[PDB]
Amino acid sequence: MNPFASLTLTTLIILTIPIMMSNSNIYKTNLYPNYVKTTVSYAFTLSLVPLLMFMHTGQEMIISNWHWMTLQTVELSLSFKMDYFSVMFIPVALFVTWSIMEFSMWYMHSDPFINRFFKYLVLFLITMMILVTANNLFQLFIGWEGVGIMSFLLIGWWHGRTDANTAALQAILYNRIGDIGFVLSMAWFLTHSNAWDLQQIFMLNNECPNMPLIGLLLAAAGKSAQFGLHPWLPSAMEGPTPVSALLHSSTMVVAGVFLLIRFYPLMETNKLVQTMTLCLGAITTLFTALCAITQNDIKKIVAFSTSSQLGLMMVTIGINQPHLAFLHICMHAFFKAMLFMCSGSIIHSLNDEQDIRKMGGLYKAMPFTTTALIIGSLALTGMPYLTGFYSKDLIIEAVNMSYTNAWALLMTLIATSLTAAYSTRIIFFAFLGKPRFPPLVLINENNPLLINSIKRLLIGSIFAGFIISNNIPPMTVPNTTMPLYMKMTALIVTIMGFMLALELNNTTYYLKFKYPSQTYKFSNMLGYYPSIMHRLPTYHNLSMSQKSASSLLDLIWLETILPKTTSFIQMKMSIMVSNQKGLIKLYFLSFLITIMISMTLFNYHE
Template sequence: MVNQPEYIAEIIISSLMSMTLMLLMGILGLPIIIYNTKHDKASFTMKAVKLAFFWSLLPASLLTITGTDFTINTWEWFHISTFTIYTSVKIDYYAAVFLPVALYVTWSILQFALWYMEKDYNIDQFFKYLLIFLISMIILVTANNLFQLFIGWEGVGIMSFLLISWWFGRPDANSAALQAVLYNRAGDLGLFVMMAWMMASTNSWELDDIFLHSQNQNMTMPALALILAAAGKSAQFGLHPWLPSAMEGPTPVSALLHSSTMVVAGIFLLIRFYPIIEQSKTAMTTCLWLGSLTTLFTAACALTQNDIKKIIAFSTSSQLGFMMVTIGLGQPRLAFLHICTHAFFKAMLFMCSGVIIHSLKNEQDIRKMGGMYFLTPLTASCITLGSLALTGTPFLSGFYSKDAIIETLNSSHLNACALSMTLIATSFTAVYSLRILYYVLGGQPRFNSLSPINENDPNLNTSLMRLAVGSLIFGQLITMSLPPKTTSVLTMTLTMKMTAILVTLTGLTTALLLTQSDSLHKKLWSHLPLHFTTLLGFFPLTIHRLLPKLTLQMGHLISSQLIDQTWFKLLGPKAILKSSMSLSKYINTIQLGLIKLHLMSFTIALLTTAFIYTIMT
C-alpha cells in the first residue's frame, strides 16, 4: 500500500521542480525574445543569467535533500508506428549540480565580456549567441531522450561555429571555426550510429528504456560509437587539433566554451550513458587508453607552446583526457566532480589571459611579457590561484577531484602503462603552470612601453573575484554534495595517499630546474621532441596539408591520366583520327599497283577459300 503523505510530498516536489525549470528557461529566453532599442541588452542578459543562477539553486537543494531523481514528461513530440518520442526532462544529481555551476561561470564570463567587448558594435548580438549556446547546453544536460540530447548537442556545435568565427574578418578565425565544425562532424557520426542502433534494438530513445533493455545485449558497438562522439566534442587524441585553433575566437568565448560547457559535453555524454559503457570491457579499455594518450600528449604540447591561450587550451585538453581516464577506471562520479571543479579555475585562467592580452595590445607570446605582477596585481593573483588549483594544491577546488582520481589510479589493478602515462601528465601540469607564472608574472617587463595598464573596472574585478571564490570553496561544497559511495574505501599507506602531492611537487621541481638552467633546458629538449610537441605531433601538417595534398594529386591523376588522356588518346577523337589515317595509308598503298601486293592478295584469298572449303567438307 502506498504511503499517502510520502506520495503527496513527491507530487508537490515534482510539481515544484517542473515550475522551477519552466521559470528558469523563461528567464534565460527573455533576453532573446525581447527587442530592446536602448542598446543595454548585454547588461540585461547578464542580469538574467544571474537571476537564473540563484533560481537553479532550488532544484539542486531539493535533490540534495530528497536524494531522488525526477523525470518530468510533458507531451508527445511525435509518433511513428510503435516508436514514440516524448518531451521529457531528467533532473538527477548530474543535472542538478551542473546547472548552478554552468550558470555561475556564465554569469562571471558575461560580466567580464561587458569589459572585454565594450568597443564591439555588435556586443548585444554576441551576448545573444552566448545565451543561446548556454540554453543548448542546458537542453543537452537535462534531456531524457536521445532526440532532445541531439538537439542540444547540435545546438552547441552550431553556436560554437558562430562564436569562434565572431571576428569573421580574420581568416584564421574562419579557418578555426571550420575546423571545429569538421572535427565535430566526425564525432557526430558516432552519435548517429548510436541513435540508429538504439532505435533498431530497443525501439526507444528514452534513457530509462535504453538502460533497461540493454542489460542483456552486447553493447560494444553503441559504446564505441559514444566514445567516438565524445572524442570529437571533447578534443581527444586524434580529433584534438581544432581546440588550440579555436583560440582565435574572443577570450569570453574561450572561457565559456573551452572550460565548462562545450568541451565537457562529450565527457558528460559518457557519464550519462555510463550504464551502457560499463557493460563492454572493450569500451572501458578504449576510454582508459584514449584518455591517457590525450592527457600525456596534450600536456607535453603545452610545455613547448609560447602562446598563452594555446597553453591553457592544451591544459584543457589534458584535463579532458584525465576525465576520460577516470571513466575508464569506472568512476563516472569523480569525472563529473572534476568537470565541476575544473570549470571555475579554467574559466578564470582564460579570463586572466584575456586581461593580459588586452593590456599588452593583443600580444600573446609569453616570452614578450614579464613583470605583470606589479602592473596587474589582481589578475596576477587570480592567475596564480588558478594555476595552483590546476596543479591540485590542497584545499583548492582542483584538489578535491584530482586527489580522489589519483588515489583511484594508485589502487587500480588495470593497465599499468596507461596509468603511468596519466601520472606523468599530472606532473607536466605543474611544469607548464609554473612556466606561465615565471614568464608572465616574474622578472622585468619584456615589452615596449605602452599606454598605462588599468584593471580598475568593476565588471572585470567583480567577475575575476567571483571565480576566485569559486576556485577556493566550491570544490569542497560539491564534494560534500556527492552521494555516498556504494563500494568500500580501500586502506592506503601514507605514501600512496600523498601521491597526488608528490607528483605535483616533482613537476614543480622540474620546472624550477628548467627555468634556472638554460643549458639543462637545451639538453632535455632536443630538436626532434621539441619540434614534435611544438608542431602538435605533426597532426595539423598531416591532416590539414599532407592528406588534402595527396587527395588532390590522386584526383588530378585519375581525372587527367586515367580519364581524360585515356578517352582522348585511346577511345576518343585522337583514336578515331589515328585509325582513319592508318586505313587511309593502307588503301593508298593498295592503289600503287605493285605486282607483289596483287600476288599477296591473290595468295591470301586462295588460302582462305581453301581453308573454308576444308572445314565445310
C-alpha cells in the first residue's frame, strides 16, 4: 500500500542480506567489506524517503506484519514503530555507520579477519535497528541484548589479550545489572497493563507508578553508562577504533536514553522518577567530565566525553524534554563519531600510539585531521550555528529556565565548562607544540577512504543541526524570554573552560615541577571508583562463592546432614548387629529374654 511501510521495512531487510551472503563466496574474498559498506550506503539512501514523507506531512505508522504467538489474552507479534524517532534515527545511524565502514576499510585493512569484523559491524547495526524500531517490549529486549552481545564480541575483538576479554565481560556485567531493571519493567507492564506493545502501555498508564519507571531508569543507566554503572564505557575502548566510534560513542550507548525517550508519556506523569533521572544525569556528566581533563589516552578522553554527553541527555530527559534529548542524540552522533575517526587517524599515523603526551606538532603534519578535529570539538563545545548548537544550547537554556534541582543545574553548568576544558586538552597536546613521537615519521593521512568518511561526517558536523532543526515540526514550546545573562550562559561557561584550560596547559611549558595534588589524583584515577568497586565486591563475591557456596555448604554440610550421617548410622548399626561371639549360650540366653518379654510387658499372652 503506502510506500512508507514498504520502504521502512526494506531499509531493515537489506541490512540482513550480506549476513546471509556471509557464507556464499564473497565472504571468502576481499570484496566483502566493500560489499557490506555498499549495502549500508544503499540502505541509508533508501531510508531518506520515509524521512522525507515524515518531513512533508508527519507520516507515522506501526506495522504488525507477523503474528508470533498468543498467550491467552496477550498477542506477541513482530511490530515495528515507524514514528518520528525511528524514521529520524535510522538515517542518522546508517550515515554514521556508512562512514565508519569506509573508515574501517582503511584502518582495519591489515586485519586478517576483516570480513568477520565487517560482518560483526553489520550484525550490531541490525540489532540496533531492531532495538530502535521495536513497537513492543519483547522486540526491544531482543534489540537490547543483541546490541549487548555484539558489543561483547567487538570489545574483545583481540581475544588473545586479557584486558580486552576483561573489558568485554565488564560491559556484559554492567549491562546485566541494567537488564535486571529492564526485565522488572517488562514484568510490571505485563502484570498491570497486560501488554508489552507501546500503544496499550501508554493507554493504561495515564498515571504510571514508580516501579516500572525505576526499572526503565535502571536499564537506561546500565546501557548509557550512567554514574554507578559508568566504568564499562571507557574500558570499552579495548575494541578497535571503528568499534569505539560506531558502538560506544555515537550509536549503541544512546540506547538507554532512547529507551527513556520511548516511554516519555509515562515519565511525563511521574515527578519522582523525573528527578531521579535528572540528578543521575547531572552527577554522571559532572564526574565524567572531571575525569577527562586529566586523561592522557586520547580514546579515554573521548570516551569520558561520550559519557558526559549521555549524562547531559539524561539531564534533558529529566526536565521533561524528550525531543530535545533525541535531537541531541542525532547531533552528537555526527561529531562524536567523527572525533573518534580523527583520533584513529592520529593513532594509525603514529604506529598505534594513543598517549597524547607522545603526540604534538600534528597541526601541520596532519592538516585535514586537524581541520576535522577542530570543527568536531567546536561542534561538541556548542559553538553557535554548528551541529551541537541546535540541541545543546537549547538544553542549557531549558535547564536554566526550569523548576529544577539547584545542584543538578550547577553541576551541568560546571560540566559544560569542563567539556571545553578537555577539548582544549586534546587539541593542545595532540596538535599544538612540538613533535614528541619517535623520530621515524610515518605521518600519512592521504587515503581516500579516511579522507572521504571523515569529510562526510565533517559536513554533517557543520550543517546537520540547521537542516534537522528546520525540518522537524515543533515538538515543544520555545523559551522566548529569558535574561541576557541566562541566554549567554552556555557560551560564557564554555569560554571560561576554554580560557582556564589554556592557562593551565600553557603552564606545563614552565620550568617548574610540583608533585600532584589530591584533586588531580581523584580526577586522574577516575574517583577511585574502579579501584574500589572492581576489587571489593568481586573479591567478596568470588571468595564467598568458593568458601561458603561450594566448600562449606555443598562439599561439607550438605554432605554431613543427609548422606554422610545416615551412612555412618547404618555402618554403626551394622557393626553392632553383625559382630557376634558365635556362642550358642548367648543366643539362647537372648532367646530366654525374648520369650519372657513376649509373656510379660509386651501384652501378647493377654
